[PDB]
Design a protein around this ligand. Sequence first.
Ligand code: HEM
Ligand code: HEM
Ligand SMILES: N=C(Nc1cccc(CNCCc2ccc(-c3ccccc3)cc2CN)c1)c1ccco1
Ligand SMILES: N=C(Nc1cccc(CNCCc2ccc(-c3ccccc3)cc2CN)c1)c1ccco1
Ligand SMILES: C[C@H](O)[C@H](O)[C@H]1CNc2nc(N)[nH]c(=O)c2N1
Ligand SMILES: C[C@H](O)[C@H](O)[C@H]1CNc2nc(N)[nH]c(=O)c2N1
Ligand SMILES: [Zn+2]
Lengths: 411, 411
Amino acid sequence: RFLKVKNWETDVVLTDTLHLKSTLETGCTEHICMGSIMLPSVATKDQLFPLAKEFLDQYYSSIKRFGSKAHMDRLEEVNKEIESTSTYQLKDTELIYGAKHAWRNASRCVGRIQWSKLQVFDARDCTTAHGMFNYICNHVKYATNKGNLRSAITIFPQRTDGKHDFRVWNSQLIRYAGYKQPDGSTLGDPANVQFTEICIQQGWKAPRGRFDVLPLLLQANGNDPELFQIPPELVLEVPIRHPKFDWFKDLGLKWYGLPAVSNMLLEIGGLEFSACPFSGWYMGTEIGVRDYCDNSRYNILEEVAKKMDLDMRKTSSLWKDQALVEINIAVLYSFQSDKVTIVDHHSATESFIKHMENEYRCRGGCPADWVWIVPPMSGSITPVFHQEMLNYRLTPSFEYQPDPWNTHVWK
Amino acid sequence: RFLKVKNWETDVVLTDTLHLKSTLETGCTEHICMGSIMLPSVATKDQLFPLAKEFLDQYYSSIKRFGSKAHMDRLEEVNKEIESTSTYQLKDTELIYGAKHAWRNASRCVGRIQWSKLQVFDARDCTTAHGMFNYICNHVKYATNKGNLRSAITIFPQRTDGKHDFRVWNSQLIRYAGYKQPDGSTLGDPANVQFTEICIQQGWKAPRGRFDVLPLLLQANGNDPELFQIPPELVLEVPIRHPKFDWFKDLGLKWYGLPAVSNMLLEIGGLEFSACPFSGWYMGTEIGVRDYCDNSRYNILEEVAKKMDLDMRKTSSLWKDQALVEINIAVLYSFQSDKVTIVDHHSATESFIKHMENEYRCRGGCPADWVWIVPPMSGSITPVFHQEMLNYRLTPSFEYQPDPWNTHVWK
Ligand code: HEM
Ligand code: HEM
Ligand SMILES: N=C(Nc1cccc(CNCCc2ccc(-c3ccccc3)cc2CN)c1)c1ccco1
Ligand SMILES: N=C(Nc1cccc(CNCCc2ccc(-c3ccccc3)cc2CN)c1)c1ccco1
Ligand SMILES: C[C@H](O)[C@H](O)[C@H]1CNc2nc(N)[nH]c(=O)c2N1
Ligand SMILES: C[C@H](O)[C@H](O)[C@H]1CNc2nc(N)[nH]c(=O)c2N1
Ligand SMILES: [Zn+2]
């Protein structure tokens, strides 16, 4: 009832009581742990008031007015509005609180030491695809801030009936296209091949190259989605050079500065915001390890090891590992030399331990998903490899949601 | 009731039904996952027969005589012997079956493709510390096999009352000593500092150096333990050179060929074998990443990066990662050039996926602990990073047990 997590490198022990306020389920049971399953498992007015009340009781607690009159009047006000429309509307303050704490509660996010410094753009007055484009361009421009990146989220109107739903069909506001080839190979980003051809379906004219920024596909109030091209001046990009190897530029690689996730669902007080793109900045490994070297992504370990003149015959020459570190020195070096915000897996993981100490201290705990927090390389030489973590689902939260093209009752 | 695990690099799906035969609990519940907790949570005649029966029903099933007369007579034979002594004795065949399947069921072991090729040394006639030494030297000599290593386990008499207990007090048959210093630093292996001084307590004369092979501390039939020195000729060692950097030899490093774990408990049919050292061979990362570069181990990242002339000012030069790969090229190269069996994290992880396919096919599943199966470096460039895994506790099993010096009713 008062659980202990240990760090096995520092011998530091923390006591978790926050997991007692946990609500949802994890997928694990007493006889089976599913902590490595990637994706694990309309609303009525009955269900919706407990959710509103629970969220409002923590909101008013957080402003040092738990149970005051303004709390009770706000409680009954929401109760009354849920009676009338079987839904309700968040105050601007409540919306910003919910957004920040959704991030605070994201147990797979290593960057949460920043969770309270988040810019919330209320787009709940939006009605059209064009209005979404406008809101999204203002997000990008603000969050990029000339490479001095700033964290932000833009929140579109909440789901109501179900068939009226705002959705960004992109998985990220900014992604590179991916095109299959005659010989079955792939140019660009293979992750995006189905999306890239969906855009060509609804009308995109593709410039079939490597790093073609996809257009936006924006669906407003449940209508069919519409293509829009982000102005290239708002899309900041970093060419990848190496601080030692000059052939590295001949690799011709580049990536975009701004990671801005757009396919997730924000849940606040039982209300569901299906379109809520959020941006921060990159941990270096996301590009250099996963984006570039995932076998099903750009898969450049081949070419980098060639130019390094490595023993690629044997598996045990560790030529893959050796070419993996160079590439990540190059991403970091490139971003930093351009004053574009990036963090390295070492600095990021150290901050998360520092963040963990604060949450356990001033909150009773910190939900954390070791499988996702440990970086995809140099695991045990970062402090989080050695840090026991308790995972559990608190709310407000970010949830996965189906892709709109698999669910949209079309016309 | 018929769970699915996916590989997100191959899109391969496996169906797990073996977890239905799971028995023990995992530490996880519906509202909290503890899959990153390192160590998670006398027997009576009532409890012991169901355990015997369950184990015998799977043993006789495995020899294609499930429910035959020989099964029923063996069932009643054990039932009768449990009535008489409130314990019982395993047949030699049952002991070998149990040992192999304990390994087969070790969800943290990446090397399980070999689980059926295991040499079982029945030491259940042992009575004294000297007899343990003899059995243990024969284990080492056999398992080492001139560097063509062979997997083996030596099984000492099962626990009976509780105060009569065979225990190897070493955590591994072969470990390097660790000595604290005047200035508070550490020579040798810091993991073993408490054990190293325990040996000096009971009588060891230490040669206070780096790589001093500890003596054995062997406890038989619950008596106080006794020191024995393994004959240095049976202890095979590999000096660590690099195939490029000749200063690497001036580092003067070396490690022992044979990983042989001795502090664990083997559970078969409800019977508890508290002394059961098992050996196989090394995955390269165990030495090069963990043994050598754990901050609380030999911690050589400092010196290797110095000799490489790396930018050690900034964290983001990835100088730690760059010096980590060289060291693991060196361990593999050294072991291989000496015909001493070693496997690299790439070859080992690929075999585990191949092993996983067989178990799901011909067994219904394979318990697997992603946190422990993924290697401590180059995680996502190995196939197990992308492989969902279900963890659950089957039996026969290997269990952790307290250290004997924290529990032994002494004299
Ligand atoms: C400020 C800089 C940030 C850094 C350095 C960072 C870092 C990361 C990384 C490396 C991941 C794993 C993603 C993956 O491997 O696919 C992640 C996950 C996540 N981040 Fe953070 N992030 C940042 C900002 C944010 C912000 C501003 C939000 C929300 C407003 C957020 C919410 C999340 C969520 C919900 C996940 C889980 C995604 C999933 O389960 O697929 N992050 N973060
Ligand atoms: C044949 C070569 C083998 C290889 C390459 C191998 C590899 C590994 C590795 C890398 C680990 C993680 C250990 C750690 O990080 O501390 C492990 C764990 C384990 N291995 Fe295997 N192993 C082998 C043989 C064996 C044998 C012969 C047995 C038993 C008879 C065994 C039983 C176990 C168990 C029980 C664990 C879990 C230890 C724990 O939970 O602390 N292994 N193995
Ligand atoms: N710094 C950041 N990064 C970051 C943060 C959150 C989320 C993500 C993206 N998370 C994607 C994980 C994922 C999703 C779907 C699939 C997939 C692939 C094929 C088929 C089906 C699904 C695979 C993966 C990764 N394995 C990145 C960042 C972005 C915004 C703020 O901060
Ligand atoms: N190839 C092999 N390897 C291998 C296999 C099984 C087990 C092990 C050793 N597993 C030790 C894990 C461990 C235990 C205790 C502590 C610890 C440290 C400080 C205080 C208290 C406990 C820390 C760790 C590692 N974090 C290695 C091998 C050996 C035999 C066959 O195959
Ligand atoms: C905190 C964490 O559970 C702990 O450091 C684990 C992580 N995974 C591991 N994996 C292996 N193979 N060996 C280990 O010692 C550990 N340690
Ligand atoms: C199978 C496994 O759960 C899957 O590959 C996960 C592992 N950990 C991860 N961790 C991060 N940060 N991102 C990921 O995409 C994944 N993928
Ligand atoms: Zn779990």
